Design a protein around this ligand. Structure first.
Ligand SMILES: O=C(O)CCCC[C@@H]1SC[C@@H]2NC(=O)N[C@@H]21
Ligand SMILES: O=C(O)CCCC[C@@H]1SC[C@@H]2NC(=O)N[C@@H]21
Ligand SMILES: O=C(O)CCCC[C@@H]1SC[C@@H]2NC(=O)N[C@@H]21
Ligand SMILES: O=C(O)CCCC[C@@H]1SC[C@@H]2NC(=O)N[C@@H]21
Ligand SMILES: *[C@@H]1O[C@H](CO)[C@@H](O)[C@H](O)[C@H]1NC(C)=O
Ligand SMILES: *[C@@H]1O[C@H](CO)[C@@H](O)[C@H](O)[C@H]1NC(C)=O
Lengths: 123, 124, 124, 123
């Protein structure tokens, strides 16, 4: 039931747009982040993921990657699409954000972690 | 010099991956062979797809990828960086999140397991 | 103005904590009442002990604390910051790691679950 | 078997010293980190934790907090003490590091995550 294809929003204000998913579970899309950790003018980036098909679960598991266009940075999201009591969709995700570093000896700090909630937009 | 994602890699738990191209866009897919599971099902090669960052031609770009487990309801996401070590050997330093499937959203809080991984080239 | 850890807090899952002093050192202990479990055992108030940072008198210091689950083999660690919101209400923004017990070190990779939590004062 | 009381070292080079643990599972100690994320002269800080007693497990679960003396920063560790095949002790931990921020609206990036391995020192 829960479908990833469409236009979602975050508790941070981000805007993601996913296209349709396949047979292979794959989808594509674009992210418009509203916050950055990088001091660079934010720009609409592409996200590539995949959705789980293992059994027609009305509430699949998903993950996707964001290739930031404005940072040497990479973000990954994983989560599950849930069907509320309101009858409403809900991505409950969690993400890891890697920062680019110049030494294997500094990598240990290269990574942050958090959540995000996505919902849908009207119209 | 050149840290390409492309190639065959193994990893600290025994797991093994195989990654292909990398478009002019960093996009790339491959397969995954875990060596271990949180679940109870026989392992099956699973497909992977990711993107390599290229926003200031760096010789050790970051990357990320999803793994669509074939034998399971859940999914894992990996993010790291392609380091060129001192030995001159490439070394993927990585980290993931394994998202398990839960029946009830009020049970979400527990579906997320976190970990590391270090990949090293297989290829002789 | 003043974000003290001291007081009674509840949290987004229903869980509830009670924290006491805060020495001249930030050290402090209290109890914990989870509302939910990864395990199968009846819940029992568990003890907690932490430390509040005070290295440049900030009005919203960071903190951390461990929870020594009484009904279980495992442990959870919380770290966050004591925000003074705009409503003027304190708000603990937090995050944890729940370390489960495993029998075999080769099974370590899966013992770590990660999550959030937001605490809000109970006290009327 | 696995005992936390003593002097350990990391894969980063850090030095921690824990005292004895109680009956309540509690211990104390001091951390000497060898890397920082903060640009401040590093200084030996105090760590307060607790160890799990729930059944005499020769391989308990532990967690402790580090009140950094040189940063507005807090670190938390959790892990398990393991008894190797070599007969040797091994803390396999994982930590979360909170950075101090000035706005609830920037908190989302306030947190990094990683590992650490501790072993023992000789002498
Ligand atoms: O700092 C960078 O290099 C790019 C940051 C991208 C924004 C991150 S993605 C995780 C979190 N969720 C969002 O929507 N934005 C921040
Ligand atoms: O147990 C499942 O739900 C399928 C997971 C398959 C492997 C996970 S991905 C994180 C960790 N590292 C590996 O190489 N494999 C495990
Ligand atoms: O299931 C166990 O092993 C005991 C865990 C008790 C509660 C965990 S701590 C993280 C999460 N947030 C809560 O308030 N409780 C759970
Ligand atoms: O940057 C700060 O504010 C203090 C950093 C303390 C060092 C951290 S603790 C996690 C990781 N492990 C270590 O031993 N050091 C880094
Ligand atoms: C997303 O778009 C909505 C309206 O379509 C807007 O109000 C919000 O500010 C946008 N946030 C972005 C661009 O991430
Ligand atoms: C820890 O001490 C050892 C020797 O006791 C030393 O070689 C190492 O550099 C130290 N690291 C620190 C001070 O964190």
């Amino acid at each position: 039931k829960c479908s990833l294809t469409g236009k979602w929003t975050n508790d941070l204000g981000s805007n993601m747009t996913i296209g349709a998913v396949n047979s292979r579970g794959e989808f594509t899309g674009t992210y418009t982040t509203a916050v950055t950790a990088t001091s660079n003018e934010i720009k609409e980036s592409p996200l590539h993921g995949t959705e789980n098909t293992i059994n027609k679960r009305t509430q699949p598991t998903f993950g996707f990657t964001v290739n930031w266009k404005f940072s040497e940075s990479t973000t990954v999201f994983t989560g599950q699409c849930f069907i509320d009591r309101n009858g409403k969709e809900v991505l409950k995700t969690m993400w890891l954000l890697r920062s680019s570093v110049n030494d294997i000896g500094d990598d240990w700090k290269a990574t942050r972690v958090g959540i995000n909630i996505f919902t849908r937009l009207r119209t």
